[PDB]
Design a binder for this molecule. Structure first.
Ligand SMILES: [Ca+2]
Ligand SMILES: [Ca+2]
Lengths: 523, 523
């Protein structure tokens, strides 16, 4: 601008204030694709994904949130959990659409199963039904010589893809052949990745490895079709990543010096959270911990690759236990409970500086629920990451509760509830009378019969730039539709949209949401 | 904090996030003291001020907003306007309580007038009634020899006070003696402040000057009693200052080189705003403009003194036309309309840097209504000043309207309406049907009979850290109680709380406000 007291240009009054597109107010729906209806025992990236995205577009939503898309752990009572994955980078092959593989010519219509029970995912039977079909398709792809063969070859050779996929395929092949609980007990030449032993693995487990890679290609191609369709409708996909990875994975076995292991590969210290005046002992998660000091020395190369793959799948994503980047709880690996542990200093902002330098800007959402310390808030604000507000947590303390709408901020994501909460109606059903009275008073004395509308409107009318509603609340469902209970081992991750509910019969729900998105400026 | 990967102290989880007391959520009432009830034709700093502050305390309010406390212009149809003051620094002597002067022994009970009509301030008669009484009191103070005489002497000699008061008293004395419309036409030795001519003024106008100074002391002492009482009840007082001062004042006459005048003292350019597709021509305010370039050279000493006096009266204050600090509209002084003018570059952040350096931190509120340019937003954000939201302006455009609550931010002041808007009920009465339908839909489909409660709750439930309600809305009043209409010359600044309404009969109103301040975290 010119010097103080001098004339501005004649057109000064045209310099109107800039709205940054990064600040655009948006609404989205939380729906894991396993929850899609259809006849094959589990939701998939096929016809229902496209009908869902058409419904989201009709509703005026510009975001879709999913849980992690990784292959869930099969190897406890973590049955179907997206947060106990077998690999940080692979896609769950159970999300692969049998109908899309028929369209591709990789499966015959006659090979599809007769319609399976539609109410709930049965994680104890679904792998035995779909796995053989996904393998048949991969084998037909590997023997084919067209366009899809050429795409498989470009995928397998892509240096971003091969940086995790080769290790993930060889890990799976060795796990399948050796079949110990963990790689800690593998024969020394496989445990310690002797170059000759790995060459021998590829000769004796060639078909296993080729099929695993072809399955990952089939996932990638289906997911890219879904994401391209979403982008065509003005919809971004928000994903989710746990901060930690599981010990028994390619992530650890192929990258041992990224973790705090002893010279035999056993974790020195593992993840958890301490007591916070909660049931004497805290939580023993038991993941290996990162050697953040070693990571800093190579520019956090392992974390940069993890983020590159996340941006390959997602427009934006949440990191669970974001607080772990400022300070993390470390339990000696011999301990059977979390009590005996220490807070260690996390990597802080330099991790995010290195990601920015290598990958450019990413919308990372900081999962920041529970007790967090001032350094966590200072880290989050330092990288301009939004945190979370969850309305189901807002009404049980005082007016200083951060989840109450008058305490929200613009750079924040507001939920009615997540996959870890009950539905609005289930939560209401078990809520104490005093808290119910508090909720109704807060939301301008609305009636108890309209609690669902009141919380949904409470999220949409927030200053928070992103509002996310679980599909279960749009459908008006109760506790039988909850996705996860945090303390349990069974019944979780299995909710599906009922077979009787179809996206083409939800025009009324789409209009009801669209009207409040219009009113509160999210359209 | 220790090095990455090392232990934190054992007490890490006790480092909970810091709530800055500057961010505390507060509620206040807009009530100019002229509006206080009582028997002497105008509200004053006496018994009703204390009853008001007791009511505000009972209501849980922690702020009181007033208009400028300066002596209003008597010398047009600006009748009683706080924004056309005779001086930037003096207090309005019409706010001086006759009852408090009786308590002081400066007036006799027998000298007080018989009760005057109570409904409205009559600016054409109130000066002729109160001025002679305030003069009698000042004369008794000047002839007294006690505690109050000693306080008058300490006041008159205080270097902050004397920096504006001596000039203001000599200006008033010369204006009274010479009695031209403006000082531009004063005899040259008074116009140009010849040291000998000023010495002669004090000899021939000694009583006038001494009385003017004693009246300003009586104002100061009454105002300080009110502010001390407010602070005793946890109440801050928010004041208000126009960016510009009037030509015919001590501000200009004693500080000519602070303004853009010609060598005879006539303004080169004057203030206004251009057309913005509004009635062809814009607004010709006609104040002199600051020589911001000359001001920068002495560290903005004139502006620093203006702020010092504002902090002497107020805990915090709004600056009207804050945009003028980034860019201001300048009209050649010969022009009779605003059309022909140019935008000039304002002083920007260095003015605020100099104020910070000289006076320390002040809560300045930026009046930022109407069309403002990006540089105004960037200046405001650069000094972390809150702007305004006014709910009565929120509902007539689209969902991107900045006055709508989903567009508010934490560092902001939200009003239902100011002294320039109608009351909520008056505004409702003249609102078009389409806009009414829009308002009711926005506020969760409340009924039209509860519009006042709906807007008040809309302000209190905002994320904006300060919410201000006009006393007229608490009392449920209509258009007959509006303080100012922006386009008019008559009927303004005259509203009083009716004689039949007393603060001790408003317990129900105080509880109703207190309950929503509790709910929305402003208590
Ligand atoms: Ca096994
Ligand atoms: Ca005169």
């Amino acid at each position: 601008v010119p010097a103080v007291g001098e004339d501005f240009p004649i057109d000064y009054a045209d310099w109107l204030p800039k709205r940054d597109p990064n600040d655009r107010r948006r609404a989205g729906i939380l729906l894991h694709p396993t929850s899609f209806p259809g006849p094959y025992g589990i939701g998939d990236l096929g016809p229902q994904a496209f009908k869902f995205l058409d419904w989201l577009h009709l509703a005026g939503c510009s975001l879709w949130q999913v849980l992690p898309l990784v292959p869930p752990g099969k190897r406890g009572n973590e049955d179907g959990s997206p947060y106990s994955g077998q690999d940080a980078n692979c896609g769950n092959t159970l999300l692969i659409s049998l109908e899309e593989l028929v369209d591709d010519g990789l499966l015959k219509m006659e090979e599809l199963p007769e319609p399976l029970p539609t109410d709930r995912v049965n994680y104890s039977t679904i792998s035995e039904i779909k796995d053989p079909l996904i393998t048949k398709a991969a084998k037909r792809l590997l023997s084919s010589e067209g366009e899809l063969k050429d795409q498989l070859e470009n995928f397998r050779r892509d240096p971003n893809i091969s940086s995790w996929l080769e290790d993930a395929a060889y890990f799976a092949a060795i796990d399948n052949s050796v079949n110990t609980i963990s790689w800690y007990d593998w024969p020394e030449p496989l445990k310690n990745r002797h170059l000759a032993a790995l060459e021998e693995v590829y000769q004796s487990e060639k078909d296993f490895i080729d099929i695993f890679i072809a399955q990952q290609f089939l996932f990638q191609r289906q997911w890219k079709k879904v994401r391209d369709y979403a982008r065509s409708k003005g919809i971004s996909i928000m994903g989710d990543m746990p901060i930690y990875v599981g010990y028994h994975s390619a992530d650890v076995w192929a990258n041992k010096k990224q973790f705090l292991l002893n010279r035999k590969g056993f974790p020195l210290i593992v993840s958890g959270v301490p007591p916070d005046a909660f049931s004497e002992t805290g939580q023993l998660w038991g993941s290996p911990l990162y050697d953040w000091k070693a990571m800093e020395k190579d520019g956090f190369s392992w974390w940069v690759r993890r983020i590159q793959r996340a941006t390959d799948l997602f427009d934006e994503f949440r990191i669970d236990h974001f607080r772990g980047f400022a300070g993390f709880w470390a339990v000696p690996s011999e301990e059977k409970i979390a009590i005996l542990g220490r807070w260690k200093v996390g990597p802080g902002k330099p991790l995010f500086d290195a990601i920015l330098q290598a990958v450019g800007k990413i919308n990372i959402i900081a999962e920041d629920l529970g007790v967090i310390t001032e350094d966590v808030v200072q880290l989050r604000k330092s990288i301009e990451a939004p945190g979370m507000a969850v309305l189901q947590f807002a009404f049980g303390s005082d007016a200083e509760n951060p989840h109450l709408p008058h305490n929200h901020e613009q750079n924040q994501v507001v939920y009615t509830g997540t996959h870890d909460n009950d539905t609005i109606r289930g939560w209401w059903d078990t809520l104490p009378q005093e808290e119910k009275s508090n909720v109704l008073k807060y939301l301008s004395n609305i009636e108890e019969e309209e609690i669902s509308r009141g919380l949904i409107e409470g999220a949409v009318s927030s200053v928070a730039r992103i509002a996310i509603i679980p599909m279960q609340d749009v459908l008006g469902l109760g506790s039988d539709s909850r996705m996860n209970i945090p303390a349990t081992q069974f019944g979780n991750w299995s909710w599906r949209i009922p077979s009787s509910t179809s996206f083409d019969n939800l025009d009324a729900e789409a209009k009801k949401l669209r009207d409040i998105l219009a009113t509160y400026g999210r359209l």
